[PDB]
Design a protein around this ligand. Structure first.
Ligand SMILES: C/C=C\C/C=C\C/C=C/C/C=C/CCCC(=O)O[C@H](COC(=O)CCCCCCCCCCCCC)COP(=O)(O)O[C@H]1[C@H](O)[C@@H](O)[C@H](OP(=O)(O)O)[C@@H](O)[C@H]1O
Ligand SMILES: O=C1CCc2ccc(OCCCCN3CCN(c4cccc(Cl)c4Cl)CC3)cc2N1
Ligand SMILES: CC(C)CCC[C@@H](C)[C@H]1CC[C@H]2[C@@H]3CC=C4C[C@@H](O)CC[C@]4(C)[C@H]3CC[C@]12C
Ligand SMILES: CC(C)CCC[C@@H](C)[C@H]1CC[C@H]2[C@@H]3CC=C4C[C@@H](O)CC[C@]4(C)[C@H]3CC[C@]12C
Ligand SMILES: CC(C)CCC[C@@H](C)[C@H]1CC[C@H]2[C@@H]3CC=C4C[C@@H](O)CC[C@]4(C)[C@H]3CC[C@]12C
Lengths: 328, 219, 45, 278
């Protein structure tokens, strides 16, 4: 009854879709991009990456067990951290840049300190307690961190104490994605249940639920305005859900594309969206016209991660071929 | 052209790259194995035999060859979301408990289903599988009490171990649909600890030799 | 859990779409990806 | 008449250069093709490219004009370059056979002690043998110019350039064939029949590959070396025709372009890389 009531409420407010209003909006056209920098050095497939707030330094995690930080301006490797576990699938970069978190199949995503009196990297904190593989743990502040695990639960931990301050439960399937809003007050999550959940950090109870996907959700990313987000699944369709309308706006799909998706990102203005498909390619779609606007080739294996800088100067895409390509 | 700070950063990056290359070259000289099977198949027994909260890594050396074995059974989750990380392993050691043929989790059926799922996975098309059958003595003691028909209604035969073990091995080896690409090795675990290690070493050597022959175009 | 989810404010999607367009056009002039940037100020050159 | 021969020689040289350059570029640019096994193939391709662009055109010009019009010192340089390049190309086959035998028969060494330094050492050894064979005739010492016909020098060149590497290659490939056979041989009736059929197919494929590899090299090089060994020892029977000599020489030179086809164009990963390029 309650679910039927919610469905009726969300359906009754849909008479005009944004896609038809976007017809009057002029198309963005073809955005031709070329590889500006080619970061190399990984000897195994990479699984995740993050962009710094200064839009100059980036960090990546790969299967060989090395966490590498590159200076995108000069390609030089700044820091290389040897990891205890080589099965890492995620990494994160603190907004202040003092700490770096990384994890994987092991139930701990360790946080390392980059600012030490000895001038060398060292382990700062190990967050044990999860009973499943950690999909991704993202920094919330210099002392708080949000972690998404494969045990269908999320956890907010205090770095100084090492104990999870908050626990989020309710997902039936394992949560494979997690994105943080610019306000750092509420976050979206995506699981294999073909649905997404909007949570808020402070009170720690379920704020909203979105559905519509037909397969496991692998990627998620907040809209720059913070009132919307995008999700991707194995159904080769990108779905944009906004927190205030509580309904789907458009579906990005094409006949040519049939493989799944791995990463979703937004530009600085949010006009265009970037997706990384398993067919060793990236697709740049228009977030408004819902049509394809660009194709980024140049990867010899499945694309695993990609990310835009804070200032939007360039976008760096990684893949299983152990090479990172910077496009502007 | 380049300032002092830029030059120092260039040398630091070069040193880091050289160290990373050396570490990768050192790590590339190890044979990686992936362990799979049901929890009640006596995995720990063979683990402690060869070795003497998620991924369990076991490192051991034998006849100048180093083996790193990754056990994933310690955690339960969706297999199709992290198994691709194990692509490229030299071999998959599968564990099966014969004595669980008449235990309802049906345990033998679940083991066969898991073996079918793993063997025919697209990520392990070229990955060899080494099958181990654990607890043969207790199976011999149990088979004197119940026939094979409690688990295999469509099977008729004698209740002798020499035939029952062969039938189980044939049934397990008949599940693969890519016999040309991959071969399955079956061994019976015994009290002698060195026998399992020798069988694993022989299987790994055979797999390496077959891969080399395929690369040379002979096999 | 679902009992209290329905007790939220419900508005029209047209104003949300208008807000999305307004946010998109407001920052369109400050998007390096949207409009190609020359080498005069491009740091990746 | 000379026009047809010149055109055919130019076409052969052009095809050889194209093949060698394509193999070299594909090996150099690709990342998945950088390994110890492929380094020897790359060195062989570079050597054959050097033969095609440095030795083949001048020999073709000599054949077309039927006489040397470039000078005695030019002929000496041509002989030195041709001997060195041919010896290096021949010894590349022996080095590749030795590497394959070591990899197949010693898996522990393949896993642990196999490094590109081994391939570099093999290439350096082949070049050293080529130099030690090419230097002595000039170190110790008009319209038609030929290699010195000293019996001792001829015996040394033939033995250290073709016969010894041929014997080593034959022994290594026989051991490889024995090992491959040992590995291959080592309701249910249908499964047994399928296993026997697969074993027979693998045996046939191995036999075909070994036969092709041996026969190409044999037909390319053996008759020329037999002729070069027999001619100086019988001055009273040097009535052999020029046509047969030209045919033998060009058949021997065709090994330079035939080697990449057998060793590079027949690999599944190499043609996959070629398709990736297009
Ligand atoms: C007894 C009765 C009578 C019978 C006896 C007499 C007649 C006998 C004839 C028997 C046939 C002989 C030739 C066999 C041809 C053949 O079978 O090839 C088939 C089609 O592929 C191509 O042809 C690919 C060919 C394309 C190669 C490129 C050519 C064009 C390049 C031009 C160069 C210049 C370009 C710029 C199938 O291919 P294949 O099974 O033969 O391929 C194998 C290859 O032969 C092995 O050598 C190779 O081993 P390796 O190279 O040594 O490492 C194996 O890995 C495998 O690749
Ligand atoms: O009357 C004619 C007509 C036709 C003609 C065409 C070309 C020509 O160029 C000379 C090239 C010879 C072939 N080289 C000889 C050197 N050779 C080698 C290499 C290592 C060891 C050893 Cl022992 C040897 Cl021989 C490799 C193959 C001369 C003539 N003469
Ligand atoms: C310069 C070029 C034209 C020389 C080419 C020679 C080739 C085509 C000839 C020479 C000797 C021949 C091989 C001799 C021996 C065998 C072994 C047999 O079990 C299968 C065929 C096979 C493999 C023959 C196939 C074709 C063969 C390889
Ligand atoms: C088929 C390919 C791959 C290998 C074999 C090439 C053979 C068949 C071809 C290539 C070049 C040809 C030779 C080119 C030049 C001459 C010199 C002339 O005065 C007589 C014929 C002769 C000797 C030709 C005969 C046949 C030849 C040797
Ligand atoms: C300038 C460029 C286009 C030169 C192209 C050269 C390469 C790419 C060409 C020349 C001959 C071609 C090959 C000839 C024979 C075969 C065997 C067939 O069963 C699969 C394709 C394959 C393997 C072809 C693929 C591409 C190929 C290797």
């Amino acid at each position: 009854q309650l679910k039927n009531q919610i469905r009726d409420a969300r359906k009754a407010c849909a008479d005009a879709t944004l896609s038809q209003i976007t017809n009057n909006i002029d198309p963005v056209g073809r955005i031709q991009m070329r590889t500006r920098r080619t970061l190399r050095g990984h000897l195994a497939k990479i699984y995740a990456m993050h962009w710094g707030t200064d839009s100059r330094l980036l960090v990546s995690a790969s299967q060989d067990g090395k966490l590498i930080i590159w200076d995108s301006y000069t390609t030089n490797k700044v820091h290389a951290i040897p990891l205890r576990s080589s099965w890492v699938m995620t990494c994160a970069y603190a907004p202040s840049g003092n700490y770096v978190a990384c994890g994987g199949l092991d139930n701990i995503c360790s946080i390392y300190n980059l600012k030490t009196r000895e001038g060398n990297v060292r382990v700062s904190r190990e967050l044990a307690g999860h009973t499943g593989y950690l999909s991704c743990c993202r920094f919330l502040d210099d002392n708080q961190i949000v972690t998404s695990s494969g045990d269908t639960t999320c956890a907010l931990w205090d770095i100084e104490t090492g104990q999870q301050t908050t626990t989020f439960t309710g997902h039936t399937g394992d949560v494979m994605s997690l994105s943080l809003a610019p306000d750092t007050r509420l976050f979206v999550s995506g699981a294999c249940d073909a649905s997404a959940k909007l949570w808020d950090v402070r009170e720690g109870m379920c704020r909203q639920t979105f559905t519509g996907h037909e397969s496991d959700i692998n990627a998620i990313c907040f809209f720059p305005n913070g009132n919307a987000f995008a999700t991707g699944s194995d159904d080769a369709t990108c779905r944009l859900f906004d927190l205030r309308a509580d309904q789907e706006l458009m579906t990005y799909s094409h006949d040519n594309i049939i493989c799944g998706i791995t990463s979703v990102s937004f530009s600085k203005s949010g006009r265009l969206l970037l997706a990384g498909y398993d067919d060793f390619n990236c697709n740049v779609w228009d977030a408004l016209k819902a049509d394809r606007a660009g194709v980024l080739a140049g990867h010899d294996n499945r694309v695993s991660c990609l990310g835009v800088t804070d200032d939007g100067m360039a976008v760096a895409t990684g893949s299983w071929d152990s090479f990172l390509k910077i496009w502007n | 052209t380049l300032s002092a700070e830029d030059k120092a950063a260039v040398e630091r990056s070069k040193m880091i790259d050289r160290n990373l290359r050396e570490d990768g070259e050192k790590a590339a000289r190890e044979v990686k194995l992936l362990l799979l099977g049901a929890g009640e198949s006596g995995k720990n027994t063979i683990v402690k035999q060869m070795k003497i909260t998620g991924i369990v890594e076991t490192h051991f050396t034998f006849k100048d060859l180093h083996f790193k074995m990754f056990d994933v059974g310690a955690q339960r989750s969706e297999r199709k979301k992290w198994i691709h990380c194990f692509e490229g392993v030299t071999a998959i050691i599968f564990c099966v408990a014969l004595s669980d043929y008449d235990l309802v989790l049906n345990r033998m059926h679940a083991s066969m289903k898991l073996f079918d799922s793993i063997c025919n996975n697209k990520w392990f098309t070229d990955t060899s599988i080494i099958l181990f059958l654990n607890k043969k003595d207790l199976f011999e003691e149990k088979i004197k009490k119940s026939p094979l028909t409690i688990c295999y209604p469509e099977y008729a035969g004698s209740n002798t171990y020499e035939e029952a073990a062969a039938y189980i091995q044939c049934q397990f080896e008949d599940l693969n649909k890519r016999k040309d690409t991959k071969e399955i090795y079956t061994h019976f675990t015994c009290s002698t600890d060195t026998k399992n290690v020798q069988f694993v070493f022989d299987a790994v050597t055979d797999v390496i030799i077959k891969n080399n022959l395929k690369d040379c175009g002979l096999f | 859990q679902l009992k209290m989810e329905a007790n939220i404010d419900r508005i029209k999607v047209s104003k949300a779409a208008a807000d999305l367009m307004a946010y998109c056009e407001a920052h369109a002039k400050e998007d390096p990806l949207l409009t190609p940037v020359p080498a005069s100020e491009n740091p990746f050159r | 008449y000379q026009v047809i021969t010149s055109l055919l020689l130019g076409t052969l040289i052009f095809c050889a250069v194209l093949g060698n350059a394509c193999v070299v570029a594909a090996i150099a640019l690709e990342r998945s093709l950088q390994n110890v096994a492929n380094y020897l193939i790359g060195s062989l391709a570079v050597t054959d490219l050097m033969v095609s662009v440095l030795v083949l055109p001048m020999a073709a010009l000599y054949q077309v004009l039927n006489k040397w019009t470039l000078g005695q010192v030019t002929c000496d340089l041509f002989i030195a370059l041709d001997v060195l390049c041919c010896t290096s190309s021949i010894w590349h086959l022996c080095a590749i056979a030795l590497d394959r035998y070591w990899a197949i028969t010693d898996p522990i060494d393949y896993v642990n002690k196999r490094t590109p330094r081994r391939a570099a050492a093999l290439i350096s050894l082949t070049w050293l043998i080529g130099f030690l064979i090419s230097i002595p005739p000039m170190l110790g010492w008009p319209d038609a110019c030929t290699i010195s016909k000293d019996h001792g020098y001829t015996i040394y060149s033939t033995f250290g350039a073709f016969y010894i590497p041929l014997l080593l290659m034959l022994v290594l490939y026989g051991r490889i064939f024995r090992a491959a056979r040992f590995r291959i041989r080592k309701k249910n009736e249908r499964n047994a029949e399928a296993k026997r059929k697969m074993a027979l197919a693998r045996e046939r494929k191995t036999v075909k590959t070994l036969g092709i590899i041996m026969g190409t090299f044999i037909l390319c090089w053996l008759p020329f070396f037999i002729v070069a060994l027999v001619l100086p020892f019988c001055e009273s029977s040097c009535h052999m025709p020029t046509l047969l000599g030209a045919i033998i020489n060009w058949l021997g030179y065709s090994n330079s372009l035939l080697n990449p086809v057998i060793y590079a164009y027949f690999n599944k990963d190499f043609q996959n890389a070629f398709k990736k390029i297009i």
